[PDB]
Each structure stands twice: as C-alpha cells, then as structure tokens.
Amino acid sequence: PRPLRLPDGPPCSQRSKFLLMDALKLSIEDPSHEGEGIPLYDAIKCMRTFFGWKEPNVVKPHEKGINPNYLLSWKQVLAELQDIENEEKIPRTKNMKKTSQLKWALGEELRSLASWIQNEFNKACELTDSSWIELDEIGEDAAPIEHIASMRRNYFTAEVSHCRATEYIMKGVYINTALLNASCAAMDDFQLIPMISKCRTKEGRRKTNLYGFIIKGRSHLRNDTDVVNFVSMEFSLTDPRLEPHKWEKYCVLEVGDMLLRSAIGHVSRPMFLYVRTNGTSKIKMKWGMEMRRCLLQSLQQIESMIEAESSVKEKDMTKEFFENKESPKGVEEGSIGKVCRTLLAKSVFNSLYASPQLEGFSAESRKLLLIVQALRDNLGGLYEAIEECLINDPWVLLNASWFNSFLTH
Ligand SMILES: OCc1nc2cc(Cl)c(Cl)cc2[nH]1
Numbered sequence: 001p002r003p004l005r006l007p008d009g010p011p012c013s014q015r016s017k018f019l020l021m022d023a024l025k026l027s028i029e030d031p032s033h034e035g036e037g038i039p040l041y042d043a044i045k046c047m048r049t050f051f052g053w054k055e056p057n058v059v060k061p062h063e064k065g066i067n068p069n070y071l072l073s074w075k076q077v078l079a080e081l082q083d084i085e086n087e088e089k090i091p092r093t094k095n096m097k098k099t100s101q102l103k104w105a106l107g108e109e110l111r112s113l114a115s116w117i118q119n120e121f122n123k124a125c126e127l128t129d130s131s132w133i134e135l136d137e138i139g140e141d142a143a144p145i146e147h148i149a150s151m152r153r154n155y156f157t158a159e160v161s162h163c164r165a166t167e168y169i170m171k172g173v174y175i176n177t178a179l180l181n182a183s184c185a186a187m188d189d190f191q192l193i194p195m196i197s198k199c200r201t202k203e204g205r206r207k208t209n210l211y212g213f214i215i216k217g218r219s220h221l222r223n224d225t226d227v228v229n230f231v232s233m234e235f236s237l238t239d240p241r242l243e244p245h246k247w248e249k250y251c252v253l254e255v256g257d258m259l260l261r262s263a264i265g266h267v268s269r270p271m272f273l274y275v276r277t278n279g280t281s282k283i284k285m286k287w288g289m290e291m292r293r294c295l296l297q298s299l300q301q302i303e304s305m306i307e308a309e310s311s312v313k314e315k316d317m318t319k320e321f322f323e324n325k326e327s328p329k330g331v332e333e334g335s336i337g338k339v340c341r342t343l344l345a346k347s348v349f350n351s352l353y354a355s356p357q358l359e360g361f362s363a364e365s366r367k368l369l370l371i372v373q374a375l376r377d378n379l380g381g382l383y384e385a386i387e388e389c390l391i392n393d394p395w396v397l398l399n400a401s402w403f404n405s406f407l408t409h
C-alpha cells in the first residue's frame, strides 16, 4: 500500500564489467590485412587508424588505488604494442611483462539512486546505425523452423539487430570468450586481450571495433567460482569530471584528442581511458558467453504476447502484432520496435548487472505486485524481504524506482 523506501547515501557508481553508454570504438572497415580475424592483429590495425595520442596523464584519480600504476600500465600497453610493430611477424598473442605496476594492479555501504543508470538503460534501448547479429542469430533449433516461428523471428530480429543492447550482447560474448579461453590457454601469463566487436554498416560493409584492452592475471581456475583478476582499459569521450560519483572504481586518464564530425563543424575532443581492476570467474564468463540468450528470452516474451492475442482472436496475430494493425489502439512505448528493444534491454541489463540483490528483488517484488494488483481490482514482512535487497546496486535501485512508479499508478 506504500512506496518502497530506497536507501539514502552517496550516489551509486558504475559496476559493469566494461563501459556501456560511455564506450568509444576505434574501427577498421571491410578488414583485409594479413591475418584478418586474429584479435591482436585487428587491435593493432584499429590502433593505427588513430593519430591523436598524446602523453597520458591522470584526470580523475582512483581514490583507493595506486594511480601511478594505472598510468604506468597504459604506457606499458602502448610500448609493448610498439615492440610488436618492430617484429617481422605479428605474434598471435601478446603476454605482457610482469612489471611491478601490473603485479600490483592484478593483485599478485548504502548508496542512493543516481540518474546515470536510467540514462544507461535509455541508451541501451536505442537503435545504432550498424547491425550486430546475423539474420539467423536467434535460436539454436536442430530442425527447420515452422513458418510462424520464422515470421516472428524475422520481425523481431529486424527490430533488435541494430539495437544498442545487441551491441552489448556481442561485446560481452566476445570479451568473455577471449578471457575464458586465455584463462586456460595462458594460465601463468599476463596476457593482453583486446576488447573487440564486429558489426555491419547500413551499406553492408563489415567493420571491426576496438573498445580497449584487458590484461588478465594468473588464472589457475580449478573450479567455477575461482576468480581471475584483470585490468580493463577502455576508450571514451566521456569526461569523468562531469559525474565523478559514477567513476568511483576507476582511474581515468586523458590519452589523446580526436577529430569529430558534429552538429557544428569538425571539433576536437579529448579522448579518455577508463582504467579499473576487476575480476570474474569461470561461471560468470560462461554466462557472459551465453548473453545471446537475451535475444531468445525477449523474443519469447514477445511470442507470449502474440499467442495471447492469437487465442482471444482465434487466428494468428503475428502480422497484426508486428505491423501494429476490444483491439489495442496503439503501443504504450510508442512502437512495436520500442517494446522489443525495451524487453531486450531489460534482459541484457539483468545479465550485465546480475547480482543476488537483483535475484531477491525480482522474486519478492513479484509477490507484492500480484498482491497489490488483486487489492486494486477488488477493493510488513514482505516489504523487509524486498527492501533488504535495496543497498547499493544501481540496476536494482532503478528497478525499485520503477516499481514505485507502478505503485503510484
Ligand atoms: O610507446 C609509445 C607508443 N606506442 C604506441 C603504439 C601504437 Cl599501436 C600507437 Cl598507434 C602509438 C604508440 N605510441
């Protein structure tokens, strides 16, 4: 009967494994260099397209970390890629020297809702000018699919293939695959692992994108919960000083200047490098490799809706649903496309921001929802279970804030 109590405190901070709305890509088009498809080779070719590098410096220090070490670590990346430039054959992988900065970096409280997480979610729902999946990406069926299932899949794919949340899926699939693979292929090495994604422009040109790099620590992962540490180094045009509370976990460097087209003419903007230490485990990297299931899960939520409409109207409502034909007289989100991308964005953010706070909040808030709906239509301890999960997680706090909007109306 009353809105949830969200915790008071300093604003919550970014805790994703890689940058989301703030990421920046160095890209090469229709790659054709010798060794296309070897990540390190792709990364160096992406690096060469940029000529605006400059002497790096800290612009937003990590309050609890050793900021000279993060700076030294980025300078070591540039120098070891410069070493590779001198060798005749570019090696398949690059193992970093076990410097003191990398040994330190690799390890060898109530927060309030901040506006940035809602902004992230809005960004995840948007369309990008590139496609991130193939037409037949979704599904893993053994047999050929029926006509109706295919039609629904083709409609849905057309609405989400360019979605920003789909970029996050493929970005996450790539980096988790590369890290999990390096975790057993190079157990004792501080391996340099580029952060790559691949897309296709509106004109059909294939493109290869570099977001940055991670460096992994030692990884003798005997079980699913063993942690491999890593250091992430991610390009960005986001000035960390605008929302410093978001970047509590980062040392942020200024490392270059980039020339951009904009609504005014060409403009020069500083390029930043977001640096943090982080960790993940076998089981989280396996889930990261499965993020394409976000596409399947949200398609199935759509298909549930179409099947309901088909059962009430005694005919298949797929075309009527996706083309937006008591029949509904519009879409609350504004379009069928927005409903699909919103469902996907929720599913992807559930994965990007998985936590026990989210698992508890999801279960307990569903109980209070069904109860409040039953009281609404026909007219203590549960609240504690819900609010016990409202501590500091941006995604949980946002979903609780959404819940409270449901309670008001
Ligand atoms: O160590 C200085 C240095 N290393 C570099 C490595 C690369 Cl790939 C580029 Cl584009 C510029 C660099 N500058």
Ligand SMILES: [Cl-]
Binding pocket: 137, 138, 139, 140, 292, 293, 296
């Ligand atoms: Cl799949």
